[PDB]
From Swiss-Prot, chains A, B:
Keywords: Cytoplasm, Endoplasmic reticulum, Isopeptide bond, Nucleus, Retinol-binding, Transport, Ubl conjugation, Vitamin A. This is Cellular retinoic acid-binding protein 2. One of its GO terms (biological process) is regulation of DNA-templated transcription. The lineage of its organism: Eukaryota, Metazoa, Chordata, Craniata, Vertebrata. Sumoylated in response to retinoic acid binding, sumoylation is critical for dissociation from ER and subsequent nuclear translocation. Its main location: cytoplasm. A motif (Nuclear localization signal) lies at residues 20-30.
């Protein structure tokens, strides 16, 4: 169905720990998980075309993509990557990322909609997964 | 033989499927997947007495039991149960679980030490089996 909406975070699991295993220093981890860094996510979906803007109190980023068409974004640790999203099913998109320069962990993400209209986001780096869950405002 | 040691995972199958057949909703499964990252198992075996600590990037749980003596733990989906472990062979133990309160699917688990020195852990609910294989660190 339809991912469009203004989404507010209600659960976050394993995010700081994932940053830790990627080598992010403790000062940056602590700020990444601070109240002031809680992400709001605004999505506008038109068929396979998506605009997703993710904002905290200090940062704002937007991606625009169509399912099945390569685009550029950043990995969960700021390295530029080429991304490609596919539908795993009607309510779930999966994204494979490839670094533009150099080598690093294999990263990906998924976003999916539940029965009850929660948005679940997961991000994976090698063997480590973090999960965020949002509800619509 | 001796189950003692610190065990690192080399493969895993059907974790989320097990939770799914137990009726855990998809939100909770995806949180559980994040909280299950990089599982490590520390075992201290002294004859028939066992201490088993399971650590992931987010959480640590510990059970202490003696083979043939009932103890309390939780099912894989987090429900309190009484458990009783028995030897099924020289190198394999099997645990049957019964809920403290209420009724539910039959759940069990096993742990086996192979001839190649691997530890195989299985957890069963209905006819779904989740399997993890570890080697000694």
């Amino acid at each position: 169905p339809n991912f469009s909406g203004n989404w507010k975070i209600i659960r976050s699991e394993n995010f700081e720990e994932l940053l830790k295993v990627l080598g992010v220093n403790v000062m940056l981890r602590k700020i990444a998980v601070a109240a002031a860094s809680k992400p709001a996510v605004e999505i506008k979906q038109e068929g396979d075309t998506f605009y997703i803007k993710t904002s905290t109190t200090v940062r704002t980023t937007e991606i625009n993509f169509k399912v099945g068409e390569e685009f550029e974004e950043q990995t969960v640790d700021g390295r530029p990557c080429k991304s490609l999203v596919k539908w795993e099913s009607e309510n779930k998109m999966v994204c494979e990322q490839k670094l533009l320069k150099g080598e690093g962990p294999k990263t990906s993400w998924t976003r999916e909609l539940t029965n009850d209209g929660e948005l679940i986001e997961t991000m994976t780096a090698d063997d480590v997964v973090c999960t965020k869950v949002y509800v619509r405002e």
